[PDB]
Amino acid sequence: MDFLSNFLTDFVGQLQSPTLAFLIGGMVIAALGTQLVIPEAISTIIVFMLLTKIGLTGGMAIRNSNLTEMLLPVAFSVILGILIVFIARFTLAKLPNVRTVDALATGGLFGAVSGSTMAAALTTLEESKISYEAWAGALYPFMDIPALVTAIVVANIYLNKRKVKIWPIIEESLQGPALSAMLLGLALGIFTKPESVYEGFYDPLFRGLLSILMLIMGMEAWSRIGELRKVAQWYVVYSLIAPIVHGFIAFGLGMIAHYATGFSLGGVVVLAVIAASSSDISGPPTLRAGIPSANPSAYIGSSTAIGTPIAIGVCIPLFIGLAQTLGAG
Amino acid sequence: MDFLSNFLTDFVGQLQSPTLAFLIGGMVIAALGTQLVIPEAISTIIVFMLLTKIGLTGGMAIRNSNLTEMLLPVAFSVILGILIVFIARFTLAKLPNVRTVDALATGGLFGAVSGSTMAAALTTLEESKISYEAWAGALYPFMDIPALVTAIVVANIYLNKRKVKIWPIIEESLQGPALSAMLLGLALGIFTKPESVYEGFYDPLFRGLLSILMLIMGMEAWSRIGELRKVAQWYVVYSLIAPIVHGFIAFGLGMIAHYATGFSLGGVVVLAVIAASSSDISGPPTLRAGIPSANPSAYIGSSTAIGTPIAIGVCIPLFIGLAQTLGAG
Amino acid sequence: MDFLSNFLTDFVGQLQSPTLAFLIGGMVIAALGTQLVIPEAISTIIVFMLLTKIGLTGGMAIRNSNLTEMLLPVAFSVILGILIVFIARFTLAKLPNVRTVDALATGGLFGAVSGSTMAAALTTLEESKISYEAWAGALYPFMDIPALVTAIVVANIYLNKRKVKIWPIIEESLQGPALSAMLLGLALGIFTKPESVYEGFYDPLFRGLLSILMLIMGMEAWSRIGELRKVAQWYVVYSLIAPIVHGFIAFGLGMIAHYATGFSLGGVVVLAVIAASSSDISGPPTLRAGIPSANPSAYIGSSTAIGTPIAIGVCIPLFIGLAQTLGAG
Amino acid sequence: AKPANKLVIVTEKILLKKIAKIIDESGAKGYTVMNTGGKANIKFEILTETREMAEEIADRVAVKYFNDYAGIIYICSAEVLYGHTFCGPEGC
Amino acid sequence: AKPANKLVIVTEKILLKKIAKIIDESGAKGYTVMNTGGKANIKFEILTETREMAEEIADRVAVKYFNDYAGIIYICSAEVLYGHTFCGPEGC
Amino acid sequence: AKPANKLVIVTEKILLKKIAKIIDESGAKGYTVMNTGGKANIKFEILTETREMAEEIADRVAVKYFNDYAGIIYICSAEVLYGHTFCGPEGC
């Protein structure tokens, strides 16, 4: 049976990792009233460089691996991203005081993927000596894009009925920053050979630049908290429980691919964590330009301030611990 | 019977290299209409860091190598940069509709050197296991500076005829950005010992930062393309054939040093590529402040959009293939 | 009889090191009239990244070492920071034409700590194969903060008598930029485990970013020099001699801990250099917001232009040479 | 010495590529966009010969984005001294 | 259009978090701060309904920071066209 | 207050160090330069006591760089409230 004795030790290990320590450390200094600011120019280039590596590592892995082995987990990521958004449409969009336009916006971010949470799952898996598929990092675009597009399409359809086109929605969402960079990383990885520039400039300092960005998110997450208390009380209950619910559905779907194909038991952890994670880098900018009517405090503050720490501190130890007690680990 | 089959593989290898793949990838995403922009603050510091490494390796090699052996190839670089500018004066400046002010400006950029093309020649040479002189990277200042100065001096003299001073032209060009950064790298390398800071912070991610800069040039090259089709039809014919002609003259001069002195057959490839390359970092800003009357679309768009891809995709495989069929390779 | 011949070789070695060569190289290009500028966005993130590494290495050293072995050297840093500021109160603040508000401000910067000079002492010590305490990098906050706070407290008290709150003085100084970043690095190092992100992103390119910052300081040091000749003639005499006097007091106090505790003879060199150094990164901004009436050119120009080169070119070779002739080296 | 109206549009940075389309389609002979803070933002500066043309850009932006996004637009009276795109081929 | 007075404050960057406190405490419904060089600096742009309130912010900054720091503040008359926080709940 | 003329010069970034020489040689008591986006321009803000002095800076820039470079300069009327370099040792 599952045990929580090692979960607390694993939970603390996530609490001390630079991905979450900097995010928490940013909250502490911002609460204390620090005047430190990271210039917007550096923040813009960090977002591009973090996702180019994600696109690159998802490109050199999709061309080096058999496509027939990675079609069912990819088909599950596409299904999962769409399913999570619709869950918020029938669960979060029906509480007493919750705007349906805001419920779809926050459902889209929770259905999308978090680069920091996904990068923390791969780091924690190898530190636990659990083997995972090398192309698990290529699942980022197959859950992010379908989740963002679904949120915009359903919300716009709901808005039209309250007094339709998908391609203009897709092309405007996908061509924006932080989403074209990942495709650029994808296109270069699949066709070209960026191994010389990926392992020398994009890989070694990817997690270094991530720590700076979590500090930016952590510092601003203090402002979102308290501003998130001015909308509704159901965006805190959802952001606390949805990552657990989304991950458990992902884990169940991962087992179907684990028995149908040779999907490793340590690879369903990535699929579970990739679904529990709520996007905070390429999600908010995409939903802001796709659903302008949505309050950009009930879906940015509910996925960055509460969405990411839970999916990175309570989900990763839970699913890795669940994989260890269920098989290889 | 020598075969061109290896040229196509080498041409494809150059097409997939990060120096050219990012430049081509920048054109593709910009054509698709991406909103991804690299902030001007990052672009300014990339130019300084890319040219400091060129200066640092150009100084740490001048003081570590015998000056007697390198004087003739260095002397040839000075004559080569001046000769190329005058070639455009009597070849491109005599076309039906071509302004002599613009022809001198584009001749100066094509006579100057390109860090993205020179760095690709050294990378491709070592991938082919062709030994080159360690100070071949010190030829950048000895061709770039004479070429830019010659264009400014000759164009100003031509302008005065329609209604002269060399030192004010030199000092204003030399003290601008992207040119004083190299001299700072040159002075530190020759006198000081920057080896600790060069191989830890200037060498390892020089080629990584180059990829970002090529993406910037590639994205903006789409705007220059089409804007170059409205000035004249001869800036495309020139920028396509001039790198081949400039390199073949450099190769012939390089073989003179290969017989007069011990200049390696892999060193004439650098001398040939360094002449075929068209400057796109320290070239346009210097000519903009030196020849304001020149149109900054017939000499920036003719050297960044067509000048560099030809000199990096069609010239490097051609000369390396020429060196392999001529001797050691 | 001890010889000064090796001091000249060590002084030349400091003259050629990248920490001082870039600072001198910045003056040379600025004097020659370069237009090269480092964007303010990059300069803002360099300061944060240089001090986070200083804070990080001061946290991973405190928790890894016995506290009883560092109580006296740390207590000496607190005493030294306060003592140096008061020295300028009774020595520099009594010259014919010297404002007492400015004298306290420059006393605070000279009593504080320089991250560049401290980083050059550790680098030079290992080049001389002199073992030093691994937690010597943790002495930066225990003298920088008391020195800056003392300068603000004494000057403000002097201002009130010349015609109030004590705690806001500390919290306003401590929560500003370049000082909260160091504490952020301190808190993460002591509690969390940032070894993965420190040794891969913060340590390997710490001195590389330092060279750029010294270039920034070197370029602006030309402007401070020459304008510093319009305030008083005693700010040059003090800045030339105070680092020698401050270091020799530090050496005497540090040598007391060498017999009282197990403080290594190579650790008093750090304590001597750390006191001879004058703060130029986190010092000027703190004193500007703490003592607005102080001229921010008789204490910035007297500690960045003259304070740092003397403490990094004439102090480090002197104290390292002194330790070698006194014992282990 | 040519009267002009300085229309200033301060909005969010997400509308950089959308407001500029409205400005260009309105016949404005060049604009000026720059970064802007505040508790991130952008600042437009469109110089229009006549007020009716400045209000034409103002109306087409407020009724399209100001309902969902946050911004303020104001007009200042400025006198253009020299400009090639503004003051025709010979003027000012 | 609603008449307004545009108070511009150009000071040092160290006063970004101190001057903005004076603006907010004075009842100004939104300001505009951006990076600025010059001879490092910052530029404020506060739109106030009345001149007496624009000068109120002016006095509270000059007598508090201009004696020690360097700065210049000036008022320009601009007409606000569209704005939600400025023109009340319904206006302009 | 003290009346003043706000001369604004918008040019290319390459002329940052050349136009500033014209401003300083003209006796202007400090200028205000800042970056401007778009895809690389700069924006100057010079406050002059009289129009005859603002046009002197305008004359020496347009006839020297506007023939080859692209730019636009305009004058706005603003009243200086507080300033040490502008309003002498005690004024305004």
Following DSSP, what letter does each residue of B83-139 receive, concatenated? HHHHHHHHTTTTSTT--HHHHHHHHHHHHS--HHHHHHHHHHHHHTT----GGGGGG
Cβ D10–E31 below 8 Å, yes or no?
no
Q: How far is A32 from A34, CA to CA, in rounded Å?
A: 6
Angle value at C-alpha B42, between B36 and B44, nearest 5 degrees: 125
* Number of Cβ pairs < 8 A linking chain A and chain D: 9
Contact of F81 with chain B, judged by CB distance below 8 Å, is answered with: no
Tally Cβ neighbours within 10 Å of residue B205.
Answer: 21
Chain C residues in contact with A33 by the CB 8 A cut-off are 171, 175
Q: How far is CA C113 from CA A103, B116, C139, C176, C252, in A?
A: 52, 41, 9, 16, 18
Residues 216-245 of A with CB under 8 A from C: none
Chain C residues in contact with B192 by the CB 8 A cut-off are 15-18, 21, 25
Angle at which helix B18-32 crosses helix B206-227, to 10 degrees, equals 40
Q: How far is B44 from C38, CA to CA, in rounded Å?
A: 7
Q: Which of A18, A41, A215 lies nearest to residue C196, judging by beta carbons?
A: A18
Which chain B residue lies closest to F65 (C-alpha atoms)?
A: B292
Q: Which of C38, C184, C282 to mutate to test the interface with A (most CBs of A within 10 A)?
A: C184
Q: How far is A59 from A282, CA to CA, in rounded Å?
A: 18
Q: How far is C276 from C241, CA to CA, in rounded Å?
A: 10
Counting Cβ atoms within 10 Å, is residue E13 exposed (0-12), middle (13-18) or buried (19+)?
middle
Q: How far is CA D87 from CA D81, F44, F61, F66, in A?
A: 9, 20, 16, 13
Do chains C and D meet with 3 or more Cβ pairs nearer than 8 Å?
A: no
Chain D residues in contact with E32 by the CB 8 A cut-off are 10, 36-38, 41, 43
Tally Cβ neighbours within 10 Å of residue B171.
Answer: 12
Contact of B188 with chain C, judged by CB distance below 8 Å, is answered with: yes
Give how far E74 is from chain D: nearest CA, Å. 14
Q: How far is B37 from A259, CA to CA, in rounded Å?
A: 44
Cβ F34–D34 below 8 Å, yes or no?
yes
Which structural domain, as residue segments, surrounds residue F55? 1-92
Q: How far is B92 from B238, CA to CA, in rounded Å?
A: 7
Q: Which of F20, F31, F76 lies nearest to residue E76, judging by beta carbons?
A: F76
Contact of A175 with chain D, judged by CB distance below 8 Å, is answered with: no
Q: How far is A26 from A37, CA to CA, in rounded Å?
A: 11
Angle at which helix C71-90 crosses helix C100-111, to 10 degrees, equals 160
Contact of C12 with chain B, judged by CB distance below 8 Å, is answered with: no
What the block records as the tokens of B49 is: 């860091």
Classify domain A5-34+70-172+210-323 by CATH number: 1.20.1530
Give the list of residues 6+ apart from residue B16 with CB closer than 8 angstroms, or none.
Answer: A191, A192, A193
Chain A residues in contact with D69 by the CB 8 A cut-off are 292
Give the list of residues 6+ apart from residue D51 with CB closer than 8 angstroms, or none.
Answer: D5, D75
Q: How far is B286 from B284, CA to CA, in rounded Å?
A: 5
Cβ C40–E35 below 8 Å, yes or no?
yes
Burial annotation B235-249 (CB, 10 A radius, 16+ → b, else e): bbebbeebbbbbbbb
What the block records as the tokens of B99 is: 């302004």
Which chain B residue lies closest to F69 (C-alpha atoms)?
A: B292
Residue in the structure block whose two tokens are 């003739």: B72
Q: Which of D77, D78, D82 lies nearest to residue F58, judging by beta carbons?
A: D82
Interface chains of chain B (3 or more CB pairs under 8 Å): A, C, F
Chain A residues in contact with D65 by the CB 8 A cut-off are 292
Residues 211-230 of B with CB under 8 A from F: 220
Going by C-alpha positions, the residue among B303, E30, A35 that lies closest to residue C48 is A35
Contact A290, A159 (CB under 8 A): no
Give the list of residues 6+ apart from residue B237 with CB closer than 8 angstroms, or none.
Answer: none
Q: How far is C141 from C120, CA to CA, in rounded Å?
A: 17
* Domain residue extents for chain A: 5-34+70-172+210-323
| Dihedrals phi, psi of C318, to nearest 5 degrees | -70, -45
Local structure of residue A92 (DSSP, 8 states):
G
Give the rounded distance of the alpha carbon of A44 from its chain centre.
19
Q: Which of C45, C175, C184 lies nearest to residue A25, judging by beta carbons?
A: C184
Do chains E and B meet with 3 or more Cβ pairs nearer than 8 Å?
A: no
Count the helices and strands in chain F (H runs, E runs): 2, 4
Q: How far is CA A124 from CA A15, A139, B298, in A?
A: 12, 17, 54
Q: How far is A275 from B92, CA to CA, in rounded Å?
A: 60
Which chain E residue lies closest to F31 (C-alpha atoms)?
A: E38
Contact of F40 with chain B, judged by CB distance below 8 Å, is answered with: yes
Q: How far is B214 from B193, CA to CA, in rounded Å?
A: 30
Q: How far is B111 from E70, CA to CA, in rounded Å?
A: 48
Counting Cβ atoms within 10 Å, is residue C96 exposed (0-12), middle (13-18) or buried (19+)?
exposed
Give how far B201 is from chain A: nearest CA, Å. 11
Q: How far is B159 from B182, CA to CA, in rounded Å?
A: 30
What the block records as the tokens of F62 is: 């347009």
Angle value at C-alpha B140, between B139 and B145, nearest 5 degrees: 115
Cβ E14–C293 below 8 Å, yes or no?
no
Give how far A114 is from chain C: nearest CA, Å. 19
Q: How far is B249 from B268, CA to CA, in rounded Å?
A: 11
Interface chains of chain A (3 or more CB pairs under 8 Å): B, C, D
Chain B residues in contact with C9 by the CB 8 A cut-off are none
Contact D92, D82 (CB under 8 A): yes
Cβ B29–A180 below 8 Å, yes or no?
yes
Instruction: Report DSSP letters for C231-288, one per residue.
Output: T-SHHHHHHHHHHHHHHHHHHHHHHHHHHHS---TTHHHHHHHHHH----SSSHHHHH
Contact F43, E17 (CB under 8 A): no
Chain A residues in contact with B29 by the CB 8 A cut-off are 180, 183-184
Which long-range CB contacts under 8 A does B69-75 form with residues at least 24 apart? B69/B261, B69/B262, B70/B133, B70/B135, B70/B138, B72/B257, B72/B260, B72/B261, B72/B263, B73/B133, B73/B139, B73/B254, B73/B257, B73/B261, B73/B263, B73/B267, B73/B271, B74/B138, B74/B139, B74/B142
Which chain E residue lies closest to D78 (C-alpha atoms)?
A: E78
Counting Cβ atoms within 10 Å, is residue A66 exposed (0-12), middle (13-18) or buried (19+)?
exposed
Which chain A residue lies closest to C53 (C-alpha atoms)?
A: A208
Going by C-alpha positions, the residue among A197, A213, A77 that lies closest to residue A135 is A77
Chain D residues in contact with A288 by the CB 8 A cut-off are 14
F4, containing H or E segment: strand F2-12
Which chain D residue lies closest to A177 (C-alpha atoms)?
A: D14
Going by C-alpha positions, the residue among C302, C310, C326 that lies closest to residue C95 is C302
Cβ F35–B40 below 8 Å, yes or no?
yes
Contact C36, B177 (CB under 8 A): yes
Contact C32, B199 (CB under 8 A): no
Cβ C197–A211 below 8 Å, yes or no?
yes
Cβ F39–B285 below 8 Å, yes or no?
no
Angle at which helix A115-127 crosses helix A316-324, to 10 degrees, equals 40
Q: How far is C97 from A187, CA to CA, in rounded Å?
A: 68
Q: How far is CA F16 from CA B43, B287, F38, in A?
A: 18, 16, 17
Chain C residues in contact with A34 by the CB 8 A cut-off are 175-177, 180, 184
Instruction: Count the domains in chain F.
Output: 1
Which chain A residue lies closest to B15 (C-alpha atoms)?
A: A192
Do chains A and F meet with 3 or more Cβ pairs nearer than 8 Å?
A: no
Q: Which CATH architecture has domain B35-322?
A: Up-down Bundle (1.20)
What the block records as the tokens of C249 is: 């007091």
Cβ E72–F47 below 8 Å, yes or no?
yes
Q: Which fold has domain C18-326?
A: Na+/H+ antiporter like fold (1.20.1530)
Give how far C289 is from chain E: nearest CA, Å. 7
Q: Both ends of chain F: CA-CA distance in Å?
A: 5
Local structure of residue E75 (DSSP, 8 states):
E
Q: How far is A38 from C246, CA to CA, in rounded Å?
A: 35
Q: How far is F24 from F39, CA to CA, in rounded Å?
A: 30
Cβ A191–B33 below 8 Å, yes or no?
no
Q: How far is B24 from B310, CA to CA, in rounded Å?
A: 12
Cβ E68–C292 below 8 Å, yes or no?
yes
Give the list of residues 6+ apart from residue B278 with CB closer than 8 angstroms, or none.
Answer: B109, B110, B112, B114, B117, B239, B242, B243, B302, B303, B304, B307, B308, B311
